[PDB]
Design a protein around this ligand. Structure first.
Ligand SMILES: C[C@]12CCC(=O)C=C1CC[C@@H]1[C@@H]2[C@@H](O)C[C@@]2(C)[C@H]1CC[C@]2(O)C(=O)CO
Ligand SMILES: C[C@]12CCC(=O)C=C1CC[C@@H]1[C@@H]2[C@@H](O)C[C@@]2(C)[C@H]1CC[C@]2(O)C(=O)CO
Lengths: 125, 125
């Protein structure tokens, strides 16, 4: 039922910017995590996430590696999650997967995410 | 466990007024920023904020485009932040989000805010 439709990847030079998007549809429930993961070699790392509570209040989280360079945000009205990627580095290269789940002990615990989007590729030369 | 519960948005004619409210609850800590951001197409801009120190003294900040038209204030006893919006203009239209965080290098650095309320819509015709 849940669909995670990604877009926005591309090839850029170090120092440049990209903006990833994930449009969700279907029966997500009201509460949980909506996250971006970078897939490299199998190797997979949390980049940023939001947690949205039943109250409607959300919380943002970033990996050390991207704090200060990336911004995660969501437009709930449009059911879209955004990852704004500035000051890109070669190490940011990878297949970016958007994932979502109701429950996880930590936002970056990929093993605890149920739903995974088809990724969008980011290449930084 | 922070909750940011917003109210007060609406539709008004240019020149009119609105008053936004955000009631906080939960474990905020004693120190940090409590801010209003305007969200348009995403794009977020800082509107106004307060910084509250552990001393109990607070400091107010405004964006250039609203200085002289808006007033931010908080009623600590009621744990409520207010944005009084006078002399409204069409460019003030947007989804107004209240955000809070312990640390930010600048009050308007939305990427550094951890907690985000469910917005309230402001439309100025
Ligand atoms: C993380 C969440 C719940 C856990 C999950 O498996 C998938 C998602 C991603 C989309 C989120 C959703 C819930 O939080 C409710 C949200 C915010 C929704 C986008 C728009 C939304 O439906 C609402 O705004 C409801 O008010
Ligand atoms: C910005 C702040 C700390 C940083 C944060 O993430 C969320 C908030 C918003 C509510 C503020 C809070 C602290 O400053 C302590 C405050 C003022 C509280 C409202 C009432 C309060 O608890 C007190 O008045 C304590 O004396």
């Amino acid at each position: 039922q849940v669909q995670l439709q990604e877009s926005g990847g591309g090839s850029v030079q170090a120092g440049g910017s990209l903006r990833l998007s994930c449009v969700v549809s279907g029966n997500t429930g009201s509460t949980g995590y909506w996250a971006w993961f970078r897939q490299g070699p199998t190797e997979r790392e949390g980049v940023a996430a939001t947690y949205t509570a039943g109250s409607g209040t959300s919380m943002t989280y970033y990996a050390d590696s991207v704090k200060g360079r990336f911004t995660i945000s969501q437009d709930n009205a449009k059911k879209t999650l955004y990852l704004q990627m500035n000051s890109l580095k070669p190490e940011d290269t990878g297949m970016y997967r958007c994932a979502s789940t109701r429950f996880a002990g930590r936002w970056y615990r990929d093993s605890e995410y149920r739903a995974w989007g088809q990724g969008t590729q980011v290449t930084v030369s």
